[PDB]
């Protein structure tokens, strides 16, 4: 078994952590336990602090916008913590953070070619330093900065099969035009193809020219007066004409991936430890009647079906895109 | 001087 450690630039501080990814079960969130190793001659007249913060970034330079929480701990022991105490020695001081079950998940917005610095999004950072007191300034040389993450995984029990149907009645047409669609399942993994089963029965006197199917991502940012952004991730267009007084039925397959959407600004990707390549953002699982906390971006996916009648008929099929639990 | 590199270390079985 291994542990993660990071050292201070001056070589008088070290932070030990069990893991970097802390799963977010809906009932409770995995605690952030650890321990700090400090030089014997460094605490002569000082005290050692540990700070964990969660921030939402939407600015490039502080015009820059950031709003954050600071959780402050100044140093029952768990099994890992007592093992670390046994291994390191007496001069290791343990800390534990129990972050709330409701809190933004690690999501980083995709940076454009012009953006520099830290990528916009939500991230967690564990910081530990030794200072004479609070008011003393702490340089980047005398503190340890480490980045952790909060993640969720696919639910054990899949939900009901998505389905959505609609009817549009045209002006000069007595009978209406009927559309139906249905996904294969609800919970889809990353890279797994989505098979939309489109079945349209036209009884009107107007034909249908093209059928457009697209998978869209709804990044809901609650800080900007609940502004909602939707960007397509996969598009499949076919010239499937259905003549009047006739029935059509076909099955279309799509698969959202990142190799095609690199040029899109403001995409939602899973959290990054640093400048790195990460997949598309997984859907956020929310508790029943969950309050809209200000920090965080809520992402959900929906499949759209559209007929371009020679005036358009469309439906939306929500689904869930998450990683399987390991 | 910048930051250090994030490393790892062993841990006893029990």
């Amino acid at each position, epitope marked *: 078994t291994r542990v993660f450690k990071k050292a201070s630039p001056n*070589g008088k501080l070290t932070v030990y952590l069990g893991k970097r990814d802390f799963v977010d079960h809906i009932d409770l969130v995995d605690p952030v336990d650890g321990v700090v190793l400090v*030089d014997p*001659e460094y605490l002569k007249e000082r005290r050692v602090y540990v700070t964990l913060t969660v921030a939402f970034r939407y600015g490039r330079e502080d015009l820059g916008l950031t709003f954050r929480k600071d959780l402050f701990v100044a140093n029952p022991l768990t099994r890992l913590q007592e093992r670390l105490i046994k291994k390191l020695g007496e001069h290791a001081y343990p800390f534990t953070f129990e972050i709330c079950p409701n809190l933004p998940s690690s999501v980083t917005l995709q940076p454009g070619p012009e953006d520099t610095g830290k990528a916009l999004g939500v991230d967690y950072e564990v910081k530990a330093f030794v200072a004479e007191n609070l008011e003393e300034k702490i340089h980047k040389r005398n503190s340890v900065r480490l980045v952790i993450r909060k993640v969720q995984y696919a639910p054990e029990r899949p939900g009901p099969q998505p389905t959505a149907e609609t009817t549009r009645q045209f002006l000069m047409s007595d009978k209406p035009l009927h559309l139906e669609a249905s996904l294969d399942k609800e919970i889809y993994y990353h890279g797994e193809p989505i098979s939309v089963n489109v079945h349209v029965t036209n009884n009107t006197n107007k034909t249908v020219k093209k059928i457009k199917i697209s998978v869209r991502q709804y990044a809901d940012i609650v800080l900007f007066n609940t502004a909602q952004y939707k960007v397509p991730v996969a598009m499949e267009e076919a010239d499937d004409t259905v003549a009047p007084s006739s029935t059509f039925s076909k099955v279309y397959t799509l698969t959202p991936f990142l190799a095609n959407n690199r040029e899109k600004r403001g995409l939602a990707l899973d959290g990054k430890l640093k400048h790195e390549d990460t997949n598309l953002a997984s859907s956020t699982l929310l508790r029943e009647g969950a309050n809209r906390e200000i920090l965080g971006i809520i992402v959900s996916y929906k499949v759209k079906v559209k007929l371009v009648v020679s005036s358009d008929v469309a439906v939306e099929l929500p689904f869930t895109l998450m990683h399987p639990k390991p | 001087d910048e930051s250090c590199t994030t490393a790892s270390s062993s841990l006893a079985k029990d």
Partner: nanobody
Amino acid sequence: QLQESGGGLVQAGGSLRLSCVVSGFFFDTVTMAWYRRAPGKHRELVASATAGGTTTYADSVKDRFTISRDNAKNTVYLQMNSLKPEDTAVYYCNTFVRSLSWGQGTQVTVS
């Protein structure tokens, strides 16, 4: 960099003087310590020495080992006296907070 010296073969009663020079780092105030690892076992702590001279030893090496620290030449010495077969291990050097890279230590084998 971090490389050690002083390893060798001794009987039960001999003495060695382990040493190492660190380059690219300065320990004018850092507390430097010597670590040992018995074969097939996890690494332990053996001795320590702050810049002020306050030195602490592990209980199994008390009254025998003595850690010297040459700040001017940037070197830490461990001197071992009255060895026993239990002291067979490979010895490393590092900071007290285990901040530097570990490197490859020197081997001590006692008959």
